[PDB]
Every structure is written in C-alpha cells, then in structure tokens.
Amino acid sequence: RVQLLESGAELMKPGASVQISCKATGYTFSEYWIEWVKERPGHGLEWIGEILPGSGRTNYREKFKGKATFTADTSSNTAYMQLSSLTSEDSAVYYCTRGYSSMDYWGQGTSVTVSAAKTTPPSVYPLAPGCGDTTGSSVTLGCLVKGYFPESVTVTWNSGSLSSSVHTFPALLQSGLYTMSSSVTVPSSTWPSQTVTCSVAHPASSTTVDKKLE
C-alpha cells in the first residue's frame, strides 16, 4: 500500500552535489526510520545512514558523517540525501527505505554517475581474425566499441548470413568513458560468401555507424 518513489538517475560533474529524494505514500511519516543504502557494483550493500522524519532525529555511518545530509519535509512526505563533494567512488545506485525490525519496503533506485565526460560517439573497431590462425567450423567475429559516453549504446549486429550465438558483453566504466564489444558465431561456409556487418547506435548523440568486417 505504501510506496517510496525516488527521483531519476543523474549524471554529475565532480565537486557538484546531488539531492536524491524519497517520497512515501500510504501511512504516517513520523515513525519509521528512513534508511538509505549504497549499491556499488562489486561492493554490495553499504548501509549509509538512518533518520526518522518528524523528530528530525538522525544517525550516520561514521564513514558517511560529513558527506551525507538527511532532511525530511513532513508536510510533503519526501526524504532527503545530499551527497556533497562528489566523486568517482560515489558513482552507484542508491536506495531509500522504510525499515524497522526489518527493512520493510525499498524505494526503486536512483543512479548517480560521476564523470568528467562530455558526450561523445563510439569509435568502432571491428574485430576480425588476422593472418591464418583460426580454422574450421564457426568463424567467430566481433565489433569492439572503444570509448564514448553515456550508456546509450545499442548494437544491431544482425548476422552476416547463416549464424545466431550473439553475445553483447557488458560495459566497463574506465577513465570516465565506456568500452564494450559485441561477438558472433558464423559458420565457415556462410563467411565471406555474404557479408556480416555491425551497426553501433548511440542515440545519446543521434550518430550511428555501419561497418562490414572482412
């Protein structure tokens, strides 16, 4: 019945700080601890800190005292998290929460990504076996994508002809830029009898590319 909705994921420059909010529908505010948690890929969950609305009371993880602030506007039923002096290690997904003798109900999720970056398009490098190595069954192929921002990358790697095992590997977040591949399973006969081609589509810039391999 109760709901906790959060503001939408942001992209912030370093230094600058964000204001995540957590609106609660379906009860009285002033009684439950408004919890917030840190979900960083790899680390897991770092309870950040408590605060009950109404009393104005608070509670922080030693670690976070000085980086986070918690406020609540009882007559608007929003909760607050202000992470000042942002940085590369705060880039993660944050949840607010109603929890007592349990972590009752969890908000959806605000993503906060810290990066210097300015929009830029995927420099597309086509992975094609070189001089006489790989032989036989499936000629496997690929299309690498080296650097760009932000996540808006989508690959139509619709086969070259006779093929299916298509893998789209995840995106690493290195040096504030993005870099991921695509990879395909095309059997000898069908290649290069016909040609396979990738299309890297980065709508964050309405820029797109088609590249035949070999």
Partner: protein, 219 residues
C-alpha cells in the same frame, strides 16, 4: 561492524530441490531487548531487492510457504523447499542489533549444469584502431560452464600484463552457460614492440590450459 559470511557463494541448483544457504554474523545479534535480528532479502536482477523472512524466523507478507528461517548463535539458515523460477537471484542476509547495519556478501541461485569447456578465439588489432595510435587485442572465451575462469595474457610469455578489462555475462537463458571478453590494452607502439601474444585461460575442464596465440610478425 560485524561480519556476515554467507557460507556459500553460488548455488547451481536444477529446479525443484531444497536450498540451504547459511549466514554467520560475527557477534550476538540478540539485542538487550530480547529478540535477535538476522533478516533475509532476495534481489531480483534489475530491482531494489526485498524482504524475505524478517526477525530470523518470522515470514513476511505475500511471501511463499516454501521458505524456512531458523538459527541461533553464529549460525542462521534460510531454506527454500521447492525452488521455482521466480526465486532465482541473490540473497543478502542482514544484521541490525549493532550499529552499523552490515549486509552479507550475497549467495546466488543459478541454473544447474554439467561442465562445458570454454571456447577461446583471439582476434588481432584493426588497422583503423591501429591508425588512431591505439591498439587492442581481445580474446573471447565464449558460451561455457562453470563460471570461475581466469585468463592470463603472457604477451610473448614472460611478462604477465595487467591493463585488462574483463566483461562477463549474466547466465544464458537457453543454455545456462556464460561467455566472456578480455581486452588487454596497448600503447600502439607497445603493440608494434612485440611479435606474438597469448591468451591463457584456465577452467577445470582441461588439464592443459586452453591457450591461443597471435603473431604480430609473419602477418
């Protein structure tokens, strides 16, 4: 603080079985109020995880009969008796008698499979990457099982480089195998400063580690 060692990190279970996945905290979780505070949660890929059994034993609202929750001391278990599709994900056990609120590592539940030797394919560098003064090499270790798989790049044997980006894959729908990429990244020149590199993958299927090579030279 106080640790929470989720006794087992990957439950490869075929559907329709029991599911023990133990969680041991560091101290007593018994507050001076009387009740202890271990608690369970299930996190479904893409969504803010959720409350399973709360207060150790106690079952939650809109929450299956198929979940057992019981313990005492430095030992707490969660037991799903008829695992069934919608229960696949990770399970953070938790603590709340001591500030701060530690969360366990998170054991996962993946589809069972029998081993499946990984297929490696090295691809050299493309002239246009070559052209921007950059140069990557990528050796794909596709559609295989089980997960655990390390991959060392003894470029020309001696040096164990480490300018590597590893991209995994969430388990396959109709396969239940995984697939991976490894991009050793060179300074164009660095690349044109050697003759043949090798990608070494060690995955308990083989005795003799699956190695593939690439000759910068005779080509």
């Amino acid at each position: 603080e106080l640790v929470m060692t989720q006794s087992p990190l990957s439950l490869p279970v075929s559907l329709g079985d029991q599911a023990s996945i133990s969680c041991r905290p560091s101290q007593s979780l018994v507050h001076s109020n009387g009740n202890t505070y271990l608690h369970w949660y299930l996190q479904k890929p893409g969504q803010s995880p959720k409350l399973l059994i709360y207060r150790v034993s106690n079952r939650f609202s809109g929450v299956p009969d198929r979940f057992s929750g019981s313990g005492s001391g430095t030992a707490f278990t969660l037991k799903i008796s008829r695992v069934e599709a919608e229960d696949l994900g990770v399970y953070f056990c938790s603590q709340g008698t001591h500030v701060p609120y530690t969360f366990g590592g998170g054991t996962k539940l993946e589809l069972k499979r029998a081993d499946a030797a990984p297929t490696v394919s090295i691809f050299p560098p493309s002239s246009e990457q070559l052209t921007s003064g950059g140069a990557s090499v990528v050796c794909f270790l596709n559609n295989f099982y089980p997960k655990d798989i390390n991959v060392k790049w003894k470029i020309d044997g001696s040096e164990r480089q480490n300018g590597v980006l590893n991209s995994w894959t969430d388990q396959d729908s109709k396969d239940s195998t995984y697939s991976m990429s490894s991009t050793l990244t060179l300074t164009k020149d660095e690349y044109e400063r050697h003759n043949s590199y090798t990608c070494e993958a060690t995955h308990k299927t083989s005795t003799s580690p699956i190695v593939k090579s690439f000759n910068r030279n005779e080509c």
